Design a protein around this ligand. Structure first.
Ligand SMILES: [Zn+2]
Lengths: 36, 221, 40, 317, 16, 145, 50, 208, 210, 169, 48
């Protein structure tokens, strides 16, 4: 709290909250066919 | 109204391609303290002008100078819109803000001819007012640009003296959501750097920091 | 013309598939309709 | 008794939304200025519509365009008629398919026709001019698109009165297309909408009925042409607004798929449309702005019609 | 003036 | 290094754009064939920044300083039909065909500020009773004189 | 193959069971494979990890 | 082509190049691909739809007195693809959609059984069986909608007696994997002949 | 179950049923086009296209006609778009017999964010592939070709998504004309009834052909 | 010899997903609070679904205007769960939305795609100990609207943990 | 000509250092690389 200004559980929560979009958006369903 | 989508081409990275090209890198920017509650020129983006901020005269100083005025403490009104002024601050002179950078360039005789009152000496106390104290702050910066040693600002001048609820109507220019900005339309930089500047991590209402370099953290794993 | 006698095997261009768009041969600007006015 | 308080709550909210919509775009009392079109373009937007049409006429061919005229100082052919139909169809394909890195996809069509005047003497009768409405009425329909403020061609179609005559008479073995003949059997006119003139400022006050005069110059010249009874089939073929014209142009060739063309033909086609023809990336970025501005203008008339409907119910009930 | 314009253009009609 | 939301990050202040276009108009006074590039410059700025009456009056001064009479007055008439006020500092700099505005805002020429204030007040007085196009035409007449 | 055997129970769906640790270490061959050297049999019904 | 009179020399010389190398190549055939027996191939020169047509007589049992002749019609629309979504969107797979009309004994959408099939990766994928006109059930059910007519369910979800009876009805009509290969071959020749006409018609427009 | 004053009109062979109402001088017309591909279950849980219909509210005292793009889900009702047309209910305005209504008019803002909420569920949308020419092979069909569907805004997502407190008043305004949740429960059950009778008649016609 | 790289003709789009090691990611078991289904554990699937339905959506991060998080407290005060919300009929949802929840017509429109699909409120395992992943598959009535896949069988509240034990709660 | 996705036409070698000779390029070979066929309507040429 003195040097870094936060604590490790709050640090883990902030790290989980800063990148919420590029962690999971969809389940990416469908099938990809071979085109060649 | 009704939550207009904006025509900027910022986008979050997908779930398929790897993260590449780390000579530009957006990350989320969170400062220490909130600054939105503060005065407009006491915020974060005006910190370098912190020594340029005029000293504050308060309401009780203004009432004391209303009752007992001094011959060379010049009270000067910096309000520009004549349709929004309804009362007269006592012992005040009208010098509107948008003319101040010309007005201090005149001689004393030309000041008297173009404003009807004498030009204040550079050792005289000057006290500025506005509706919120914003036009008076810019006028105080213009008065301190010239060598005026004692320049003071009453923040919230008319709105605390006469009890009005007005504003100086500062636009704080923000692009219309049809105006597409610079980095989308342009070949000023290569395609990898153009794709990596236009990406952001999260919603596009918050602030972000652009890194010019990055090295891999080999000591984690 | 076989593959080993080809221009693409003289460089390291593969035999079939997606074209290497960032290869230096594909980045080389061609104007073949003006070739008779310059090299003729 | 509840119909009055419901229609008055809606008519007060629509007046509150229309009030809060104007003050957002208003800056210091003066309203939001529309984006300016490029040089020579005259935009017409009908009231209560989904589209806006802009025209441009290059006299003496291509050589009087904007790019071919700028030079360094202090040291004939047939006229071209441009027409850019721009609907309000703007979407992003990254919502439905996250693998596609496209922020904005806006489609707009370009119709370019040519017209021979009487003043050109040099190359009059050395060959029959195929661009003339008297001879074929050949016209190029360039379907365009804007993919993240970058103009990409969708299709280049060459349509004449021949393939309009072919679709109506002998597209089958002895008959025309059964759907194209039926679509022409149901052609009702649209009610006249008053158009607004967001022209180029320099041509805003010079001539007003100039896109109307060149539209009726060709319509006279095509209906009394070598191909007479096939012009209603050609009007629906060149009609850019609706699904009957999109099916009619899909019965024609549709051009080659452009990414399969040679790289020399892809850059020479882009050098012709952007540089020579004048349909530029400045024009392409303006259409994405004008699709946004006139959507905002149509939202306010929509808010004015919610209030007008809700006030007419509460005074009746 | 916008409501004045839509009545002249016909977007706000009268009683049918 | 600090990226705001892009509606406010890539917006320059109108004072900056007015100063840039007034430098361009002073150069078009010195050399009219600059004007074409200025047109290209305007062709980006209206597409990137916000079309304000300040930058439109500066573009009217740009067209006037190049010798372009008809399109300058027609842009002024377009501002008048849009109810946009002509900028008074551009109206004063138009009738001062010296004094490139970087050293006017810097203030290295201390004299003729009375003339600048007189032209600004004359522009305000003319705008009280007329539209922007008459003020711009008066500025064009005095500049060409 | 190279198989691992743990002493305690970890089911395929959830960890709850009716066995103790001594029970499952006699079930899942942990005592067996601890006391068994090479050349002997190991059951295929015992779950193998990694 | 003088550059003072003609500013489009980058396109007119490139399109004159593209006329010759599309004709000087030896991989193209001058003759159309030979259709199977009975089929007559029509194609309007301007459009992108070519028609097939043949007559046919089914197998009729001895209890019936007369076999009525049929009218088989093939309708192929050329496939369109958008290059503006490339290189962002994936490569669209090449497939050859066509329509197969069956009319008993006079247009295309009156008293006709229409079946839509897709030739993809060397095989036919029958999609829908669309009816047009008044047909007998079991009453009379009329399908008079030609654009938004009821096309039937997709055959992945349809009942098993509907599937094997249809393929026996289709194999008897000589519509199978070898017939769909010809539609993949004839549409390539049609699109090639339209492309050289498109290059010829574009040079007349740009140079004018 | 049926609403109070609504006559049904459904002929076998067409996948359309039309409901009409008239109170006073105002006329209410509900048009639905049942999907042939696959429609979602009435229980909802377990290609599954939603039941989308249109409602035409004509009021000659106002001089405008209100077209409401509505989607019935789980028997309830959401309203996706509201547009205004000139004059009374003309015959050309209804998309019956595969001729569309008025073309090239402003469709309206988004009243609800239902389409953005379906992508959190990862429900498959109307747009199958990115390529519009890929889905234009089955032209003049709303369910498989969304780029020319009137009910799907021709693939366009508008600029403004209307305020919740404002457009809650608009949904309450239409419920007094019979565009309540009681109608959408009937349209959900009648679209499943048309989808059985169309598939049974198409099968039995196909049996007699072969 | 030149060996060809083994590919497939038909591949699901889930296999196109990215991993920084091009490998299978770690699936850490959930915390010890989820071992017994209780009143503290019941509504964590309801909370995350209402959290995702109000946040930003898509690659362009479209903000959902209707905030469905304000109705989370009144839903758990009634004792109704997300799995119990899927068991309610159509007539029981009109009573729940109008009387208790006071859901507006646009807030009802943003919640109905989550109820139309019958999303299974099962916390999926993830690489971290704190999991914010709910299985978005459509549930079936035979398996209690739990979608019946990956071990979500008719009482499974959390992936890797025990059943509901409805006699207790 | 027109290219297809995935199908390339093989072409023979000139057998002169490959496409770019690493050993060197003579004056007459570099003369053709000098006056390369740029379109002359948009090309400025200059020598001193
Ligand atoms: Zn599940």
């Amino acid at each position: 709290m003195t040097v870094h200004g936060t604590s490790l559980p709050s640090t883990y929560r902030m790290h989980k909250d800063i990148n919420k979009a590029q962690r999971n958006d969809r389940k990416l369903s469908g099938n990809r066919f071979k085109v060649l | 109204q009704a939550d207009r989508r904006t025509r900027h081409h910022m986008m979050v990275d997908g779930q398929i391609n790897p993260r590449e090209w780390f000579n530009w890198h957006p990350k989320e920017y969170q400062p220490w303290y909130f600054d939105r509650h503060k005065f407009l020129y006491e915020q974060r983006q005006y910190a370098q002008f912190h020594h340029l901020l005029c000293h504050q005269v308060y309401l009780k100083d203004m009432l004391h100078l209303m009752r007992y005025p001094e011959p060379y403490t010049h009270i000067i009104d910096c309000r520009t819109s004549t349709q929004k002024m309804h009362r007269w601050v006592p012992h005040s002179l009208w010098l509107p803000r948008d003319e101040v950078e010309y007005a201090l360039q005149l001689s004393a005789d030309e000041f008297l001819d173009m404003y009807g009152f004498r030009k204040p000496d550079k050792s005289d106390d000057v006290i500025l007012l506005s509706h919120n104290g914003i036009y008076s702050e810019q006028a105080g910066w213009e008065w301190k640009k010239q060598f005026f040693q004692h320049v003071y600002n009453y923040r919230g001048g008319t709105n605390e003296l006469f009890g009005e609820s007005y504003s100086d109507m500062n636009v704080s220019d923000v692009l219309s959501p049809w105006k597409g900005p610079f980095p989308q339309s342009g070949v000023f930089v290569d395609k990898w750097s153009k794709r990596k500047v236009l990406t952001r991590t999260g919603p596009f209402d918050r602030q972000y920091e652009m890194q010019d370099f990055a090295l891999p953290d080999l000591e984690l794993e | 013309i076989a593959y080993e006698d080809s221009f693409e095997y003289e460089e390291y261009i593969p035999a079939g598939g997606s074209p290497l768009a960032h290869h230096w041969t594909e980045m080389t600007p061609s104007f073949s309709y003006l070739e008779d006015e310059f090299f003729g | 008794v509840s119909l009055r308080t419901i229609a008055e709550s809606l008519g007060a909210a629509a007046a509150a939304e229309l009030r809060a919509e104007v003050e957002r775009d208003t800056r210091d009392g003066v309203a939001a200025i529309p984006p300016l079109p490029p040089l020579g373009w005259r935009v017409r937007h009908p009231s209560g519509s989904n589209y806006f049409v802009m025209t441009r006429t290059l006299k003496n061919g291509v050589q009087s365009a904007e790019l071919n005229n700028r030079r360094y100082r202090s040291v004939s052919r047939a006229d071209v008629h441009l027409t850019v139909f721009a609907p309000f169809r703007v979407y992003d394909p990254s919502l439905h398919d996250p693998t596609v890195d496209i922020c904005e996809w806006s489609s707009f069509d370009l119709v370019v026709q040519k017209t021979v005047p009487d003043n050109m003497v040099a190359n009059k009768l050395l060959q029959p001019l195929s661009c003339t409405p008297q001879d074929g009425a050949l016209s190029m329909y360039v379907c365009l698109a804007s993919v993240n403020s970058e103009m990409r061609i969708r299709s280049i179609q060459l349509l004449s009165m021949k393939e309009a005559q072919a679709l109506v008479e002998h597209a089958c073995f002895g008959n025309g297309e059964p759907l194209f003949l039926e679509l022409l059997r149901r052609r009702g006119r649209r009610r006249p909408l008053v158009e607004r003139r967001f022209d180029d400022p320099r041509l805003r006050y010079e001539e007003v009925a100039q896109p109307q005069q060149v539209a009726d110059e060709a319509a006279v010249a095509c209906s009394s042409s070598c191909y007479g009874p096939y012009y209603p089939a050609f009007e629906m073929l060149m009609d850019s607004c609706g699904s009957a014209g999109e099916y009619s142009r899909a019965l024609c060739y549709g051009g080659p798929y452009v990414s399969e063309l040679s790289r020399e033909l892809c850059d020479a086609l882009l050098d012709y449309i952007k540089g020579d023809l004048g349909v530029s990336d400045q024009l392409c970025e303006y259409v994405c702005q004008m699709q946004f501005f006139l959507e905002q203008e149509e939202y306010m008339t929509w808010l004015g019609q919610v209030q007008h409907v809700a006030n007419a119910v509460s005074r009746t009930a | 003036d916008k409501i004045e314009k839509w009545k002249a253009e016909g977007l706000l009609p009268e009683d049918y | 290094s600090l990226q705001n939301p892009p509606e406010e990050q890539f917006a320059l202040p109108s004072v900056l754009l007015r100063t840039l276009l007034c430098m361009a108009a002073y150069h078009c006074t010195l050399d009219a064939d600059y004007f074409t590039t200025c047109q290209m410059l305007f062709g980006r700025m209206e597409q990137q920044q916000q079309t304000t009456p300040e930058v439109l009056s500066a573009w009217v001064y740009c067209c006037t300083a190049s010798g372009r009479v008809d399109e300058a007055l027609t842009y002024a008439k377009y501002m008048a039909d849009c109810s946009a006020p002509f900028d008074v500092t551009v109206f004063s700099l138009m009738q001062h065909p010296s004094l490139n505005p970087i050293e006017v805002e810097d203030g290295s020429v201390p004299h003729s500020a009375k003339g600048l204030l007189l032209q600004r007040r004359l522009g305000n007085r003319l705008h009280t009773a007329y539209r922007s196009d008459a003020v711009a035409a008066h500025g064009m007449f005095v500049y060409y004189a | 193959v190279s198989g691992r055997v743990y002493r305690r129970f970890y089911g395929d769906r959830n960890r709850v069971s009716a066995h103790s640790t001594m029970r499952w270490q006699h079930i899942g061959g942990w005592k067996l494979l601890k006391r068994i050297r090479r050349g002997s049999l190991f059951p295929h019904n015992v779950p193998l990890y990694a | 082509l003088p550059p003072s009179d003609f500013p489009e020399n980058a396109l007119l010389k490139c399109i004159e190049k593209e006329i010759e190398d599309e004709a000087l190549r030896l991989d193209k055939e001058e003759c159309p691909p030979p259709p199977p027996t009975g089929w007559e191939m029509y194609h309007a020169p301007g459009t992108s739809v070519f028609y097939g047509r043949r007559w046919w007589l089914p197998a009729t049992a001895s209890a019936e007195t007369r076999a009525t002749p049929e009218r088989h019609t093939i309708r192929v629309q050329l496939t369109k693809r958008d290059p503006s979504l490339d290189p962002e969107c994936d490569v669209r797979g090449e497939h050859f959609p066509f329509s197969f009309f069956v009319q008993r004994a006079l247009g295309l959408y009156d008293q006709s059984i229409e079946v839509r099939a897709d030739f993809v990766d060397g095989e036919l994928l029958v999609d829908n069986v669309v009816f047009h006109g008044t047909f007998k059930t079991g009453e009379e059910v009329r399908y008079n909608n030609i654009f938004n007519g009821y096309p039937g369910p997709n055959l992945d979800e349809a009942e098993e007696e509907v599937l094997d009876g249809l393929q026996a009805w289709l194999a008897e009509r000589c519509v199978d994997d070898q017939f769909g290969e010809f539609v993949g071959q004839y549409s390539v020749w049609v699109e090639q002949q339209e492309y050289e006409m498109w290059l010829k018609r574009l040079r007349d427009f740009v140079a004018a | 179950h049926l609403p109070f004053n609504f006559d049904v009109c459904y002929e076998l062979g067409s996948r359309e049923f039309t409901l009409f109402s008239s109170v006073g001088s105002t006329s209410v017309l509900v048009f639905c086009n049942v999907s042939s591909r696959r429609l979602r279950s009435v229980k909802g849980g377990q290609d599954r296209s939603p039941v989308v219909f249109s409602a035409f509210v004509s009021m000659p005292t106002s001089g405008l006609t209100i077209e409401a793009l509505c989607c019935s889900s789980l028997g309830l009702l959401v309203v996706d778009g509201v547009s205004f047309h000139q004059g009374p209910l003309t015959e050309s305005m209804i998309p019956q017999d595969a001729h569309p209504g008025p073309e090239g008019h402003y469709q309206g803002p988004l009243l609800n964010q239902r389409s953005l909420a379906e992508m959190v569920v990862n429900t498959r949308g109307c747009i199958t592939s990115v390529d519009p020419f890929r889905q234009q092979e089955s032209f003049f069909d709303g369910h498989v070709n969304p780029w020319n569907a009137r009910s799907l805004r021709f693939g366009h997502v508008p600029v403004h998504t209307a305020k919740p407190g404002f457009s809650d008043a608009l949904c309450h305004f239409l419920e007094v004309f019979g565009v309540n949740d009681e109608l959408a429960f009937f349209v959900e059950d009648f679209a499943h009834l048309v989808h059985r009778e169309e598939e049974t008649a198409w099968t039995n016609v196909l049996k007699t052909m072969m | 010899k030149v060996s060809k790289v083994p590919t497939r003709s038909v591949i699901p789009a889930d296999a196109l997903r990215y991993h920084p090691r091009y490998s299978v990611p770690r699936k850490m078991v959930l915390s010890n609070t989820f071992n017994v289904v209780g009143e503290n554990n019941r509504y964590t699937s309801l909370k995350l679904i209402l959290e995702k339905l109000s946040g930003h959506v898509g690659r362009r991060q479209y903000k959902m205007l209707c905030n469905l998080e304000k109705h989370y407290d009144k839903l758990k005060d009634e004792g109704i769960d997300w799995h119990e919300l899927k068991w309610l009929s159509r007539e029981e949802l009109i009573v729940l939305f109008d009387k208790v929840l006071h859901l507006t017509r646009t807030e009802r429109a943003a919640l109905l795609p989550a109820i139309e699909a019958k999303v299974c409120g099962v916390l999926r395992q993830t690489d971290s100990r704190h999991s914010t992943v709910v299985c978005m598959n459509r549930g079936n009535a035979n398996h209690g609207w739990r979608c019946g896949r990956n071990g979500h069988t008719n009482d499974v509240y959390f992936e890797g943990k025990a059943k509901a034990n409805t006699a207790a709660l | 000509a027109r290219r297809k996705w995935g199908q390339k036409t093989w072409s023979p070698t000139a057998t002169n250092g490959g496409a770019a000779p690493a050993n060197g390029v003579s004056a007459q070979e570099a003369l053709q690389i000098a006056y390369r066929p740029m379109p002359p309507s948009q090309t400025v040429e200059y020598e001193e």
